[PDB]
Every structure is written in C-alpha cells, then in structure tokens.
Design a binder for these strands. Structure first.
Ligand SMILES: [Zn+2]
Ligand SMILES: [Zn+2]
Lengths: 197, 196
DNA sequence: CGGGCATGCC
DNA sequence: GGGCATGCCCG
C-alpha cells in the first residue's frame, strides 16, 4: 500500500550506525562494506550493528529494524521468509517463523506484524552502552538468503534502523543494504570490484 | 513399505522407450541409455513411450510414481518443495503437491495413497495410433531435483506400472530422473564422469 | 533455447 | 580456498 521512509535522520540525539571491520575471507560469517554501505552475511549468523548517539535518549526509547526491497518495482511488497524457511522449525523461542530479521541475546525483544501495512519488524528497548564502551551493539540474524525462491528471490533489500519513543514516534533513522548469501567475503569482493570496472 | 521398482515385462511384454534427443546444453528432455536416466527441464513435456508385444485387456491403466533412490531417503514421500507447491502453475487437474503430472490427457487421475501417502498419476492405457508401434504419454516434472525443502539434490526414480482396472500389476519399468536447468549439459557431464 | 555468469556448497 | 554443482537472464 505504501513505502516506509529510508532517509538518514540523526535527530536530536545524533543517532548513527557503526559496523565492525571484519575482512573478506571467501566465506566469513558477516562482513560490512564501507564503500557500498552494505552488509554481507550468512543465514542465521551474528550480524553486529552498533548504535551511536551524542546525548542519551530517555528510557522507554525503542530501536526497531525493518527490511524493505531496495528496488521500487518491489518496494510495496513485504519482505518475508520464503515458504521453505518459514516451515523449517528453527525457532529461537520468540521469533515468529515468517520474520526475516531476528535479534539475538535479548529477552526484551518484541516482534511486530503490523495489522495495517503487514510489514514485519523487530524491536528492542534502547540501552546505553556498557562501561568502557562508546556504543550499543545489537546482534541481528537474517533468516533467509537473498536468493531464496518464493521470498527475496534475488531482490536486494535495505535494513532500516529507527529510533523511536514509547508510542512509535520517530527520533532517528539510518539504513544499510544487506545481501544474505553463502559466501559473504567473495560476494563483497565481487561487488566492490564491479565498482572499479 | 517402499514400492517395488523390480522391472517386469509381464505377460504383455511391457517396456519403455524414450525419444533420442541428444545433448545440446538446454535440450528440454533427453534420456541416457548408459545411465537409464531421463534429464529434463521443469514443466517441459517429457514423452515416455509404452511398448507392448500384445494388447492388454480393456480397462488397463498406466501409473507413474516417484521414489527416492538412496536408501537413507527411500521411505520418504517424494513431493514438490514448499515454493513450487505454492506457485501459480496449476493445470487445474494435478494436486499442487505432486511432482509428476500428465499433460494432454483429460482422463488423468491422481492418487494420494491411503497408507503410504505417496503420490501417483494414472491414465487409461490406449493402444498405439494407426501407423505407430508404441503409445506415448507426456509427463511433466514440476520441481527441480536441486530444490531446497524437497528433493534437495537427492536422486529419484520414476516407476511406471501397467495395471488392470482393479490395480493388479501387469508390468513395471523404471528410470532415474534428474529435473534440472540444462539437461544436455548435465547428461553429457554424468556420462563423462563414468570414465576413468 | 543457451553463453555467460550468479550463487549454492564443500 | 579452489573448484564445482547447478540455477537464471535476456539475446
Ligand atoms: Zn529462505
Ligand atoms: Zn521445487
């Protein structure tokens, strides 16, 4: 019916994202390309995303992740797990089986299947960093490959990360492209080389 | 539990023939005598010829069923993967879960077995048309051998049985099937892997 | 159909 | 990491 905004918005708290530096060994479970602003990862493997802010949002602030198709031809379509993976019983105990994006390690995670847009998202309460740290790290998992037939079917996606108050009002927004694939190092390297040809 | 795959020509001298289609990369259906194996593309016509020495009785039928070839999966029902089951490729006769359809036969019947839950497709036996010495059935395979959540790279066999009207066996033959994007490429590859 | 390549897997 | 199996796009 409509399309979510993907416009970078630092907001009043100076909200931005950070990623580890991981390298490009042919596989490697998760690697991020600064050149492409694109995460490359394997199915069900830890994808760390760092949340950086300048002030600190109030308690009750939430951090939401949602996938959308990058291409305008599919952008109104909801990003979901393919029929196979939806039915494969790899439940972590909380994530519903149709959801592409999961959060690891957080008892307070909530999954939303919006009644009106039909879009899936996963949301955790915002927490300040630990002592000795400058950022909050969320561990995401992507539960289908970009290639899965009947699901993403090779269509590229964006993950939109939004900072929101308790009622769902926008406080900040950032995004990154993601490719979920068998060989993240190889594929990251390939796409970076295509940028130099 | 596993249906028999024992070849028997039975009293009517029942056996199968296949077109001799060669190995151009993407030939739609091609059969390897050395491998007794059909290689074919998803949803493309796969002609299977029925040859008999004498005409079986009125009411005879011809059934096709797929089974897994490897012992570790032989007990599992062969079915289409979750994706293909749900794609919009119905012919309005075949159940969406069934791997094997018959095209061009309004008298086709499909069965899910009471006890084994295996799928099959059955058509009336018809004698060859005038000028012909065999009867051709046009099968279609509706999932690739490689499909995740289904065959998932496990080899299958198709078992063709000739049956009387009550289902009693008159004859049986079988062939391996690989459903794939490039049947010629893949046949030539397999036949080359036979050699030292 | 199919050269050329994308993308699974070990 | 290499490679090889095996699928898809658009001419
Ligand atoms: Zn999937
Ligand atoms: Zn399939």
């Amino acid at each position: 019916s409509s399309v979510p905004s993907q416009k970078t918005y630092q907001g009043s708290y100076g909200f931005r994202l950070g990623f580890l530096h991981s390298g490009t060994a042919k596989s490697v479970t998760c690697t991020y390309s600064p050149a492409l602003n694109k995460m490359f990862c394997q199915l069900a493997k830890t994808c760390p995303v760092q949340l950086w802010v300048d002030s600190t949002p109030p308690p009750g602030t939430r951090v939401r992740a949602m996938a959308i198709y990058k291409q305008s031809q599919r952008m109104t379509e909801v990003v979901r797990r393919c029929p196979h993976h939806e039915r494969c019983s790899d439940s972590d105990g909380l994530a519903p089986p149709q959801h592409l994006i999961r959060v690891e390690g957080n008892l307070r995670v909530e999954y939303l299947d919006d009644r009106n847009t039909f879009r899936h998202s996963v949301v955790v309460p915002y927490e300040p960093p630990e002592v000795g740290s400058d950022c909050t790290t969320i561990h995401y998992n992507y539960m289908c490959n970009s290639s899965c037939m009947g699901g993403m079917n090779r269509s590229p996606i964006l993950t939109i990360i939004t900072l929101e108050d308790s009622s769902g009002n926008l406080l900040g927004r950032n995004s990154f492209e993601v490719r979920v694939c068998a060989c993240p190092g190889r594929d990251r390297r390939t796409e970076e080389e295509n940028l130099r040809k």
